[PDB]
Structures are given as C-alpha cells and as structure tokens.
Design a protein around this ligand. Structure first.
Ligand SMILES: CC(=O)N[C@@H]1[C@@H](O[C@@H]2O[C@@H](C)[C@@H](O)[C@@H](O)[C@@H]2O)[C@H](O[C@H]2O[C@H](CO)[C@H](O)[C@H](O[C@]3(C(=O)O)C[C@H](O)[C@@H](NC(C)=O)[C@H]([C@H](O)[C@H](O)CO)O3)[C@H]2O)[C@@H](COS(=O)(=O)O)O[C@H]1O
Ligand SMILES: CC(=O)N[C@@H]1[C@@H](O[C@@H]2O[C@@H](C)[C@@H](O)[C@@H](O)[C@@H]2O)[C@H](O[C@H]2O[C@H](CO)[C@H](O)[C@H](O[C@]3(C(=O)O)C[C@H](O)[C@@H](NC(C)=O)[C@H]([C@H](O)[C@H](O)CO)O3)[C@H]2O)[C@@H](COS(=O)(=O)O)O[C@H]1O
Ligand SMILES: CC(=O)N[C@@H]1[C@@H](O[C@@H]2O[C@@H](C)[C@@H](O)[C@@H](O)[C@@H]2O)[C@H](O[C@H]2O[C@H](CO)[C@H](O)[C@H](O[C@]3(C(=O)O)C[C@H](O)[C@@H](NC(C)=O)[C@H]([C@H](O)[C@H](O)CO)O3)[C@H]2O)[C@@H](COS(=O)(=O)O)O[C@H]1O
Ligand SMILES: *[C@@H]1O[C@H](CO)[C@@H](O)[C@H](O)[C@H]1NC(C)=O
Ligand SMILES: *[C@@H]1O[C@H](CO)[C@@H](O)[C@H](O)[C@H]1NC(C)=O
Ligand SMILES: *[C@@H]1O[C@H](CO)[C@@H](O)[C@H](O)[C@H]1NC(C)=O
Ligand SMILES: *[C@@H]1O[C@H](CO)[C@@H](O)[C@H](O)[C@H]1NC(C)=O
Ligand SMILES: *[C@@H]1O[C@H](CO)[C@@H](O)[C@H](O)[C@H]1NC(C)=O
Ligand SMILES: *[C@@H]1O[C@H](CO)[C@@H](O)[C@H](O)[C@H]1NC(C)=O
Ligand SMILES: *[C@H]1O[C@H](CO)[C@@H](O)[C@H](O)[C@H]1NC(C)=O
Ligand SMILES: *[C@H]1O[C@H](CO)[C@@H](O)[C@H](O)[C@H]1NC(C)=O
Ligand SMILES: *[C@H]1O[C@H](CO)[C@@H](O)[C@H](O)[C@H]1NC(C)=O
Lengths: 321, 163, 321, 163, 163, 321
C-alpha cells in the first residue's frame, strides 16, 4: 500500500514567459492585453461625435459654405477631424492662434450660435457684395457665413465704430478678420482709404491691425489673404471695433453653453453608427482587460495603453508533457 | 523549479486529479484514487487572485496620451511633446512586461513550493512508518485501508498505533 | 527530553502589504512615508521668505503704491505669492514676458534698488502730474513708484534722448512702459504729438514701440492701458531711450546682487514665524523619512514626494495570532 | 510561506523568546528555556538593514517638480508641462509602492528561510539520535542535560558519543 | 542563501571541479575524484543565458536624448526640456540598477537551489543505505566501487541490491 | 567509502551587488556597462561630420567671410558646433527663428548651393559697395557672401520688384535681411527714402518688414543692426520681393538635396580622423555592451545611456574564501 503527493495536469497549451525561460506551458493563464477593436468611429456613452468629414475646425467655425452641415451643430462627445481636410480656408490666409483655439475645444462639448451684429445693420456700408470665387456655393461666389466682408458704398468707406455688450451669462467666442489686398490699386478699389486699420478692444484685448501688402502666389485662384483673429468675451464685458478699411465683421459668435471632457481625434475613418464606452481613432473598444495595444490617444473609460504584443499571466502551474 | 518538487522528484502532474491543484493518490487492496488537498489549493487560489488584482491595480493609474497641435514654426516643442509622450509609453510598457515576467516566474515557483510543503507535511507525519520511495510516494510497512489513507490526508495519522 | 526550533512573536499589530496578501501582521516594521507638516509658511535655513501678501510680483517690481512694504526688500530664501493677488496692475495693462521674468526670479535671492534717472532730472518735461485714480495712496491719486509717467510742459512734448551706462559690475533689471490712450483727443491732450514712438537700444535690444489706440472697457475705472517691458542690462553696457510721446521712464532699476536657488511658491497661507529646512506651500516638513506625500513643489533638503497614502516596510517576520 | 517553516510545520512563534528572531527551546529534567541563535539572527539583521538602505538610496535620486507659469495663450505648453510633471509622479509613486510590495514579500520569505535552515542545521547534527516530532521539535533517545543541549546550539553535538 | 546549501551545510566550493558548476566528489579504495553533473549544470547555463538576454532586451528600447536649442526668452521651455530629458534618465538609470540588484540576488539563490535539489536527488536514491554526514557527503554502509559511484551519478543506484 | 555533493570555486575576485549584500565575490560575472571612449570626434559609418570649427550655423549659412571653408560643403553624417563660436554674426543683429531653423537641420544631410539672384543683375541699384569693417576678409571690408547689401545709385533708390520661381523639384532654403540704421541721417545717406519697407510673399508667406531706428551700443565696432529672415520655398512656388529701402537681397539660396537622420552636436573637440558607428560629443564608442555612461546625446547605433558607474550581472555562483 502507498500514498503519493502530486499536482494537477491538463490538456492546456497556454504558454507564459519568465526571465529564465520562455514559452512555458501552464495549466491556467490569464490574458490581460486587449488586442481587438470593431474598426469604427462611434457614439461615446450614447453621445454622438462631431464628425467634420472633409471640413476642418476653421472651416466649421468660420462658416465655410461647404461646411453647411455644421451650422448649429448639436452637442458632441468628441470631435473627429481628418489629417488633411480639403475644406479648410476657402479664401487663402492664416488663422491666428489656431492651435490654442483647438486646445480650447478639448474643454468644450457644445456651442450655441447667436447673432451679435446683423448683416442688415450695416446701413452706411455695403455688406452683400463681400464674396469671392474661392468660396463657391451652388455655383455662385460666396463667403464664410459667420463673418461679413464689408466694402465701400458709393465710393466712400466711412469709419466703423461698433460695440457689443455680452449680456448672456456665458463666455463668448468671437471671430473677426482683416483682408490683405494685392496692391495699392486694389486697396483703393475696395476701401478707397489708402492707409487703414482695425482696432479691437475689450477689458483685456488691446489690438490694432493694419493690412500688409505683398505680391503673393495664387492659392485657390487668389493672391489676396485673410487673417482671422479670435477672443473669448467674458460675461458683462463689451467688445469694441473701430475701422476705416479692410475689416471682416462678425455676424455670428459661438456661445459656450457646456464645458466638459472632449478631444479632437485625428482619423480618416467615417461613422459606424455604433455605441461604445472607450473610443480610439482606429476603432472602438469593449473589454474588461486592464490593458490594450490599439492606439495611445483614447477617450472615455479605457484600459491602459501599452506597446506590447503579448501580456499573459500564469495563474496555474507548469503543465506536463 | 526552485523547490525541486514540480518536474523534479515528482516527475509529472496528474490528468486524473481535476478537483484541485495539489493532492494525494492512494493505492491499496480496496482500490486507488485521487483526492485534492483543499487547504493548500484554496491558499494557492487566494494568493494568485490577490496577485492578479495587485498587478492590475498598480497599473490602473498610469500615463495617458493627449492630442496637442503645433504649427510649422513650433517644431521644437512638437518634438519635445512627441518624445515626452513616447517616453512614458516605453516606461509603462517596460513596467508591464517586466512585472509579468518576474511575477510569472514567482507564480510557478509558488506552486512548486506548495507541493513541496504538502509533501513534507505528509513525510513528517509518517516518519519511519513508511518507505520514502523518492518519487512523491510513501509505501507503508503496515496495511493502510481507506480510513488509514484518510487519516494521512486528515493530518491525523496516528503514528503510535502503526508503530 | 527535547529541543525545539522556533521564532519570535510579540504583541505588535503593525501590518504590511505584499503581492499575494494584504494586511499581514508583523513583529517589526518601518514606516518610510512622512505624512505630517506644521501647516505654516516658514524661514528656510534661518533665511526668511519674501511674502508678498496681497501684492503680486508685478506690483512689487513696478512699485505699486499698495506694495510700499516691499520697497528695498531684504534677501529671501524663497518667494510666496497668492493665486489671485488683488494688488497687481493698479493701472490696467499687460506685463511683457511676465512669465519669463518670473522664471528669472527663481535664480535670484536678492535685489538692491538704485536710481538711474532722477525724477527731478526731467527739466524739459513735466514729471510730477503723471498719476491716476486707479493707483491711490493715502486718498490721493498716485502711480507705480519706480517709473515716471511723463507729460508735456506748457503745451510742448519735446523729444527725449536719454542714455544710462551700467558702471556697476552686476546685471541690471531695467523696467519701462508705454501708455495707450483712449482716443486721438487724449493723445494730443497728454503728449500733443499725434504720432509718437519709444525707441530703446542696448548691445542686444533693438526695440521701437508705438501706441495702439482702441475703445476699451473700464478696468479699475480706466479704459486706458499701460504696457510694461523689461531687459537685463549687462555691466559696461548702455541703454538708450528716444521718445516723442507716451513714455513711462525708469526712475529706479533693480540690481541683482545675489543669484541662488529660489522659487515662487503659490500659497494663500501667511507666516508662522517658524524655521525649517524643507518647505511646502501647505506647510513645513521636519522628518528623517525618505518619502513624504504632502505636496510635489518643495524647496530645500526634502524627502521625495510620492502620491502614496502608505509605505511600510516589513523588517521583522510574520507575527502569530 | 515559501519555505514551510513559519506558520507551517512550526505552527506559531514564541512570545517567550525576546533576545532574538530565531532560536531554541529546550526541556529536560533540570528545566526549560529559550535561547536565541545569535549567528542566524545577526545575519538576518544585516540583510534587512542593507535592504532598507538599498531601497532608500535607489529612490534618493528621483524626479522633482518645479513651478512654471504660463499665460492665457500658452495653454498647450502649460498642459504639456502638467502632464510631464504628473507623469513622473505616477512613475515614481508606482516604483515606490511596487518595490515595497515585492521586497516585503521577499523579507517574510527570508525569515521563513532562516528558520528552516536553522531547523535543518540541527536536524543534520542529531541524525538518528533523536525523534523528528514534526512540529519543530526533536525528542532525544538519550537523556540530554543542559551541556548536551548546549552542544546542539554550539554546533558541537557529539553524535558518536550518544550513539 | 535561501536554500541553505551553498555556504550553508556545504561549507565551501571545490577549486578541483573545473568542468561544471555542480557535481560529485567520491572517495573509495580505488581513489577519489570530481565529476561534474552535466544535466543540472547545463540547465543553470540556459537559465542564466536567457536571463541576461531577457534583461538586455527589456532595456533595448528606452529613452533617447535629443539636442534642442532655445533663445534667451524661452527659458521656461528650455527648463521644461531639461527636466524632461533628465527625468527619463533617472527613471531608466533606476530601472537598470534595480533590475541588476534584484536579479543578481535571484541568480545566487538559483545556484543555491540547484545544488540543494541535486543533493536531495542523491539523498532520495540512497535512502537508508548510507549515512547522511551533514556536510554534503553520504558515507556508504557497503563498499562502493567506481561502478557503484557511477550508478549514483547515473540516477540508477540499485537500492534493493545493497539493502 | 563516500560520495559528496558540491559546487564550483575558483580564483575569481569579481564582485556583484544585491539588495541585502554588497561586494559579493562570484565565480563568473558579466559587465554590461561600457565605460570608455577614444576621446575623438569621428566619421560616422564612413561619412564625415561637418565640423564648423569656430564658425556658427548662422555664419556658415549667411556666408560669413571667415567661414570660407564652408562654401559648397559636402554631405555630412552629423554637424559639430562649439558652445560659443567666435565667427557668428560679424555684423551685429538677430537671426529670426534661428532655433527652429537649427531644428530643421537635424532632418538634413546635404545642402547644394545655387544662385537665384545674380549680383550683376542689379542694374538699377549699386550692389558692390555693400560692405562693413565688422566683416573683414584679407584686410579689406567684406560682407556675408550669400546676400547682397543694396544701396542707392546716383542718389536714388528706386523700388525693387523681384520674383523667383522654384523650378527645381526640391524645397529651397531662402535667406534675406533688413538693415536697421542708427539715425534718420544715415537712413537718407544709404537709401534716401525716409520711410522704407520690404514685402516678401509666397503661397504661404505674407511678410512686410520696416526698419526700426534706435541708438544702440557698438557691437563689433558698429551700432547698426541686421535682422535676418528665412523661409522654405516649395517646388513650383514663387517668392516675391518688393522694397524701397534697407533690403538685403538673396544672391544664393541653399537647395535641400538629401533629408536624413542628423544632429547638431555641441563640442569643443576637433577631429580625430577616426571612424565609428556610435558617436558622442566626448568621443566615439566601439563596444557590444548593452549600456554606456559616456554622454546622453549620441548619434548612430549606440548602447543605451545610463548614469551608473557600475552594472555587473552575476552569472556564476558565490565564490569561496
Ligand atoms: C485677363 C484679365 O485681365 N482678366 C480680368 C480679370 O483679372 C484676371 O483674373 C485674375 C484671377 C488674375 O489672374 C488677374 O491677373 C487677371 O488679369 C478681372 O478680375 C479678376 O482678377 C482680380 C485680381 O485683381 C480678382 O482676383 C477677381 O476675383 C475676385 C474673386 O473672385 O475673388 C472677384 C470678386 O468679386 C472680388 N470680391 C471682392 C469682395 O472684392 C475679389 C477680391 O477683389 C479679391 O479676392 C481681393 O484680393 O476678387 C477676378 O475676377 C476681371 C473682373 O475685374 S474685377 O472687377 O477687378 O474683378 O476682368 C477680367 O477681364
Ligand atoms: C461726465 C463727464 O463727462 N465727466 C468728465 C470726466 O470724464 C467722465 O467722467 C469720469 C468720472 C468717467 O465716468 C469717464 O468715463 C467719463 O469720460 C473727466 O475726466 C475723467 O474721465 C477721463 C476719461 O477720459 C479720465 O479717466 C480721467 O481720469 C484720469 C485718471 O484718474 O486716471 C485723471 C488723471 O489725472 C489722468 N492722468 C494723466 C496723467 O493724464 C488720467 C489719464 O488722462 C487717463 O487715465 C489716460 O488714459 O485720467 C477722469 O478725471 C473729468 C475731469 O477731466 S480731466 O481733465 O480729463 O481729468 O471731468 C468731468 O466733467
Ligand atoms: C571722428 C569722426 O567723426 N569720424 C568719422 C567717422 O565716424 C566716427 O568715427 C568712427 C571711427 C566711429 O568711431 C564712429 O562711431 C564715429 O561716428 C566716419 O564713419 C565711420 O563711422 C560711421 C558711424 O556712422 C560708420 O560706422 C562707418 O563705418 C561703416 C562700416 O564699416 O560699417 C563704413 C561702411 O562703408 C558703411 N557701409 C555701408 C554699406 O554703408 C557702414 C554703414 O554705413 C553702417 O554700418 C550702417 O549703420 O559703416 C565708419 O567709417 C568716417 C567715414 O565716413 S562715412 O562715409 O560715414 O563712412 O569719417 C570720420 O571723419
Ligand atoms: C516561442 O513561441 C513563439 C510563438 O509560437 C515563437 O514564435 C517563438 O519563436 C518562440 N521563442 C522561443 C525562444 O522559443
Ligand atoms: C453692459 O456692459 C457693461 C460694461 O461695459 C456693464 O456694466 C453693464 O451692466 C452691461 N449690461 C447692460 C444691460 O448694459
Ligand atoms: C486592510 O486594512 C484596511 C484598514 O486597516 C481595510 O480598510 C482594508 O479593507 C483591508 N484590506 C483587505 C483586503 O482586507
Ligand atoms: C560706459 O559704457 C561704455 C560702452 O558704451 C564703456 O566702454 C565704458 O568703459 C563705460 N564706462 C565709462 C566710465 O564710460
Ligand atoms: C564595496 O566595494 C567598493 C569598491 O571596492 C568600496 O569602495 C565600498 O566602500 C564597498 N562597500 C561596502 C558596503 O562594502
Ligand atoms: C513657375 O511657378 C508657377 C507658379 O508661381 C507655376 O505654375 C509654373 O508652372 C512654374 N514654372 C514655370 C516654368 O513657369
Ligand atoms: C478523519 O478520518 C478518520 C477516519 O479515517 C475519522 O475517524 C476522523 O474523525 C477524521 N478526523 C478529522 C479531523 O477529520
Ligand atoms: C560548547 O559547550 C560545551 C559544553 O556543553 C563545551 O564543552 C564546548 O567547549 C563548547 N564549544 C563551543 C564551540 O562553544
Ligand atoms: C550507468 O553505469 C552503470 C555501470 O556503473 C551501467 O551498467 C548502466 O547501464 C549505466 N546507466 C546509464 C543510464 O548510463
């Protein structure tokens, strides 16, 4: 008669690595790395992402006529922008502190658009012939819908002195611009006054822009430039404009109703019409794993990103051949 | 393994023992069979469970990447930013892979330890009342029925009776 | 007869955590995390901190009249500034490269103030009526004590051409400013000359400032703005000023006698009149522990900061029930 | 524990042994008493002391936060700065907590090892001149006075005399 | 050491054994000599080799510094940059030095383990056919020639013949 | 008769550290830290470094006359620049976005120089008397060889309108400058026109520079300043210049033929005429070690840098006394 001491074996082929030995077959293991995704851009916690498609953030916010989809957008969980969106600045130019503004959008979940300067209200200036072939809509020449390109009425561009008081109990994103003409002949043709300026003031802002003339290459069929500027107007504060030429007036200014966790995701992908609680630019994640290796930039309740191809913990013991 | 039991003096495991990690196999006139040792098995289950949760939780707070944009004359800070984000991923990737490697090795040696301690436990009960065969088995000088076998698993093997 | 082998037990209840088991009672342990502080702002190694109280760094350095405490300050171990100090720029404006200057103060332990341009020395300009209601002292209108707000004498603002040679064998922090008036009527009222400038030169500096006019919101009861600039004037180098309007001249410039390890601490707390060798914004630390969890930003000989609530090392062995 | 001695075949510690970590308890006609084994105890004291200092020193050089200010249109670099400082705190917090966890476990197993090696040391001296009871105790076939007990603690137990 | 063999019950190593890490020394009427145990030695060589490569490879991807220049009014980002680069060097320096320390300790205990398992292997073969001297040596009750010695190293020691 | 079990010992004195014990003598060990270098700056993979010696990057690229060695430089593995090179800007001034340009050179292995504006081609302006004593060559007054300092011909400085089309299928580094004179008398003496400008345009660039006058300290015997600007001109794009004064025209523009891994190394050391596959500012490395402790900034196939003085792995076992 005899009694023996021994241990479990089974038909498992799961292997784990150790310092001294690799590919050790064990009886039980636990994978802790999530390796898969659905391959789709998706609603986060039910809340749909703002998918700009081929429009950029600038095009959306300036109201580029190709970005008509994104007039009065509903609130978003996160934003999705392509790497090189074609519908950016239809009229050539620069966006001043564009990256800093984009960063501000990471703290923003919803804008509500409002009119501060009516387009009709320009009774002493011409406001409806401020268009270009670079921004076309339905075959006709158009422009950034949120701002008014002002020109002279009957060969006179009188000084503009416009003020807006922020009576809403919200911060307000105001956008405006300056036009840079090709030569002194076009300056006079558009605004007459040879030397011009735009002064913008708030409690904090103390700005004065002047148009810079230069011979430039044609971009989108135009060698003229537009330089767009922005500010956040705090509640109970007034913004003041004064200009005798080259001024792109604000018609609409976006109102910041909700501030939450958001992000500008960079992705060529479109929309899967799926729901998730953890989103990546490559697709969505649905797992209980403590780790994943899909993509570093995620939004939502996610496992931690690592570069590993494999993370498996031994739970059982060395399995026998 | 460090403790010499698993794949050591006990050459291989038992496909026939399904209700536990460590246990006994007896053979006598009445028959033979596998019986899992619950105490040592449950202790191993607890140690490994805690370990997995301990590992999960230590990694639970770790670096998260964020998207940040820079223009064409901000290349230095763009590059600083990239290296910062990448640098932390290498640190956390290294931590995860190393911890798994180190703790996997400790887990297998833990199992080896538990088998050896269970083997010694039995050895210390039986004393010179059985032959230590050298393979994990003890061969009795006296006839050992299923109650006798049970007393060994009990911890209650009455040495003075069979001596 | 018998001999046994065994191990120590005792009445200890100290516990330690391990990977596989938590709250393991041991016979001996060693806490390595410092968890306490005295709750006070304190002298470091005997050397007192510069506590600005409700004044900011700008207010102190420009010589805001409410910061009269901080005229000719003694040397400091570190500086303490509140999050939102009320006595900042009494007259509305901006401080140019304020953060870069603040960073320079982290390498500075002592300033000595000196006069480079006497206030009397402005014989061709009016110098004693350069005040505002925004900076009040003892009921009367006053101004930043370290700089002179120059105005016209008998309806003429002649060109200013002043130079200062740094004969001290030290770097010298020079401060000056430009005034931005509300409208063209105030420009002429103050300085007469309609178009004005300020040119500042050194071996390195090549600056020319012009006043920017804009309609601005009233801050501290004034819609005018002051924009302050600075430089470090190296020894044996001269600074040159030329201006026909809107110039805030330097009366005093701070001399950098000592450069050492310092820091601008952010804290609402005041002064405990205590001494320490490791200071935090939350309070002071006095321990031999290798770690603490009070606050990341410390100054002096300190243990390392960690976010842990608990770090205890087992020294003894598993204690018996 | 890994080595099976502490809370294992030696079920519990001794409140009555105050002058050391590991030692012996004897009982004979003349009396009983605890005697701490100095060699194994001092060796344990040295190992743990070095370990604590080794741990302290490895953490002694580590990331230090510094205060840096940014204006309202420098939010990206302000945020980069925050993540950098926070990221290093998580790395160093993780290192500290993990090291304590891992080395605490090794410290308890170290103590378990030292007891077992001391027990085996005695076992190897006594050989078949005493009964291995199974509880940490050896029961002598011969009468063993206080000098006899001392020879076992000595390392000088004269096996051939009592055989 | 943890396993009590090296510098333990086997007081010292053998200058005279050059063809392996662990092995046997025999002494009988015909002579004496050292014979390295190949199996346990090759197993140790493999474990240490993998360990060294495992260590090398985990460190193979790690932070790399890059040169970045900043002007006189970019001191904040210059300082951020310095702290970032320095911070990662401290992390990777710490990782390297700690890993070496921890794995060096495990390597020495690994060797201690291998000797002990080899000693027990022999002990379990010989059983009560030899005297366990307490110093790593087994003294035979029967005369044991070079073939008899070889059977012990073989693993083929025929216990029933010499019993 | 007896058989014993035992272990190897030898005459080794190599020691290793562990957590609980330091200086443990072992039978075998493996050093993994490379501690040595040859002390020389060297060719990387056969390809020689661009050693600027006492010239800076600015001096080389602007064509400072002391940097005649570095006209039409061959391709380089990496660049070596001293900490404080003496031959920098011979004529005092600033280099606009110098650090950003230097960063661009980390992605560049070879420039090829080409002429875009011939010096002779200035038929309406004087081009050969644009020199200063600050940049001397062979005893005579000279200037940055890559740019033309233009002055008036027979007391008239007519407007310049020059355009260059990038017909090469490469990016093109263009350099130009503006001169800042001492006073209004020198402005008229050099260019006559009292108010002057320089407008530069591309598809992206929209610049207009104006000279800033100020009294400045003499640097290199001159109180005048030169401010140098740059751009990358993409293929098939034109750059346009317009100026009525103070313009430093481009004669040559560097063509970017090869883009590869490069670096600007900071070192006082010269040239060993040696070859390596891993280079540091302190010297070159030739080892198979996984680590080194020479210097963090390396180029090429290198082991990882650590701050350790010592990294030794135990391979063997505890060796006996
Ligand atoms: C062969 C010829 O001379 N044809 C002229 C047109 O000019 C030609 O086409 C241009 C694209 C360019 O290649 C010219 O060199 C060329 O000669 C001429 O007008 C056009 O050219 C001007 C350039 O100065 C403008 O580009 C203009 O386009 C618009 C535009 O769509 O953007 C027209 C628009 O209504 C204008 N809007 C406003 C609010 O002013 C803008 C704007 O002035 C400009 O973008 C600001 O920089 O320009 C082209 O139509 C054409 C009509 O003359 S026009 O009245 O001056 O426009 O007449 C052809 O014979
Ligand atoms: C109802 C009315 O018209 N009252 C005028 C005053 O102006 C108005 O009343 C103020 C109390 C306030 O409500 C204003 O919005 C309004 O215009 C007028 O002057 C005052 O207002 C002006 C605005 O243009 C100034 O703010 C001035 O304040 C000072 C100041 O304290 O800062 C006075 C000071 O002496 C000036 N210092 C210097 C060196 O010039 C400054 C300075 O000019 C300005 O800050 C630069 O931007 O302004 C108010 O006193 C008042 C007295 O006239 S005054 O001669 O201009 O001072 O007369 C009432 O009838
Ligand atoms: C004692 C006296 O008045 N001597 C004048 C010279 O000017 C004075 O003496 C100098 C030695 C020096 O110490 C000056 O500080 C002082 O004013 C005068 O010209 C010289 O000084 C002027 C100062 O404006 C210039 O710096 C000039 O230098 C050059 C130069 O080499 O850089 C000469 C060069 O040909 C010029 N090149 C071009 C393309 O213009 C430049 C350039 O004008 C300047 O750098 C742009 O800011 O200046 C000194 O030669 C001297 C000759 O007169 S000059 O025609 O003005 O050159 O005449 C003495 O009597
Ligand atoms: C371990 O297994 C993997 C996956 O099957 C295989 O690709 C790899 O080559 C193996 N490596 C070693 C060292 O055995
Ligand atoms: C408008 O703004 C001013 C400040 O410019 C504020 O004091 C006032 O109360 C605001 N509201 C209205 C209704 O005028
Ligand atoms: C351990 O102890 C703490 C407090 O001493 C207790 O709150 C915690 O829940 C315990 N953890 C476990 C796993 O029992
Ligand atoms: C003043 O500064 C000049 C430089 O402009 C320097 O050369 C001179 O030696 C200084 N000292 C005196 C006393 O002039
Ligand atoms: C170990 O050795 C080094 C170098 O030989 C010596 O300087 C050091 O003091 C020693 N440290 C200890 C703890 O023995
Ligand atoms: C020159 O550049 C223009 C745009 O400025 C481009 O369209 C043209 O094809 C280029 N080449 C020639 C030979 O004109
Ligand atoms: C164990 O088994 C025996 C029968 O073999 C029984 O008599 C005894 O009560 C049991 N003891 C325990 C502690 O379970
Ligand atoms: C130990 O004790 C015995 C007495 O019991 C004594 O004779 C012997 O000399 C001692 N040896 C040592 C090494 O202490
Ligand atoms: C080992 O040695 C004996 C002789 O000493 C021989 O008869 C036997 O076959 C050998 N066995 C093996 C496995 O080598």
């Amino acid at each position: 008669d005899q009694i023996c001491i021994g241990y479990h074996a089974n038909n498992s082929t799961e292997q784990v690595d150790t310092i001294m030995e690799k590919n050790v077959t064990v009886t039980h293991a636990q994978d802790i790395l999530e390796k898969t995704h659905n391959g789709k851009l998706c609603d986060l916690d039910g809340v749909k992402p703002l998918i700009l498609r081929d429009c950029s953030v600038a095009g959306w916010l300036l109201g580029n006529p190709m970005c008509d989809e994104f007039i009065n957008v509903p609130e978003w969980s996160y934003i999705v922008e392509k790497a090189n969106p074609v519908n950016d600045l239809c009229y050539p130019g620069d966006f001043n502190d564009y990256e800093e503004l984009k960063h501000l959008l990471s703290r923003i979940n919803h804008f509500e658009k409002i009119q501060i300067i009516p387009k009709s209200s320009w009774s002493s200036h011409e406001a409806s012939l401020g268009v270009s072939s670079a921004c076309p809509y339905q075959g006709k020449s158009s422009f950034f819908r949120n701002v008014v390109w002002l020109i002279k009425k009957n060969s006179t561009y009188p000084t503009i002195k416009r003020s807006y008081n922020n009576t809403n109990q919200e911060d307000l994103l105001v956008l405006w611009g300056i036009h840079h003409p090709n030569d002194a002949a076009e300056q006079t043709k558009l605004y007459q006054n040879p030397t011009t300026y735009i002064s913008v003031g708030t409690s904090t802002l103390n700005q004065r822009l002047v148009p810079r003339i230069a011979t430039r290459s044609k971009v989108n069929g135009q060698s003229g430039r537009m330089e767009f500027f922005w500010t956040i107007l705090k509640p109970n504060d007034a913004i003041n404009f004064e200009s005798n030429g080259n001024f792109i007036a604000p018609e609409y200014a976006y109102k910041i109703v909700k501030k939450g966790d958001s992000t500008i995701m960079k992705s060529e992908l479109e929309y899967g019409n799926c729901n998730t609680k953890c989103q990546t630019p490559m697709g969505a994640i649905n797992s209980s794993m403590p780790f994943h290796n899909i993509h570093p930039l995620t939004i939502g309740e996610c496992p931690k990103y690592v570069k590993s191809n494999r993370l498996v913990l031994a739970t059982g013991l060395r399995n026998s051949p | 393994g460090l403790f010499g039991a698993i794949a050591g003096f006990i050459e291989g495991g038992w496909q026939g023992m399904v209700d536990g990690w460590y246990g006994y196999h007896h053979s006598n006139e009445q028959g033979s069979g596998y019986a899992a040792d619950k105490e040592s098995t449950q202790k191993a289950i607890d140690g490994v469970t805690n370990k997995v949760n301990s590992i999960i939780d230590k990694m639970n707070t770790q670096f998260e990447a964020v998207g940040r944009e820079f223009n064409n004359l901000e290349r230095r800070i763009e590059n600083l930013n990239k290296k910062m984000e990448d640098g932390f991923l290498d640190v956390w990737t290294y931590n995860a892979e190393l911890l798994v490697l180190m703790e996997n090795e400790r887990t297998l040696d833990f199992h080896d330890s538990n088998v050896k301690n269970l083997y010694d436990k039995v050895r210390l009960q039986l004393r010179d009342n059985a032959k230590e065969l050298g393979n994990g088995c003890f061969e009795f000088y006296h006839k050992c029925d299923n109650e006798c076998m049970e007393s060994v698993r009990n911890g209650t093997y009455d040495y003075p009776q069979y001596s």
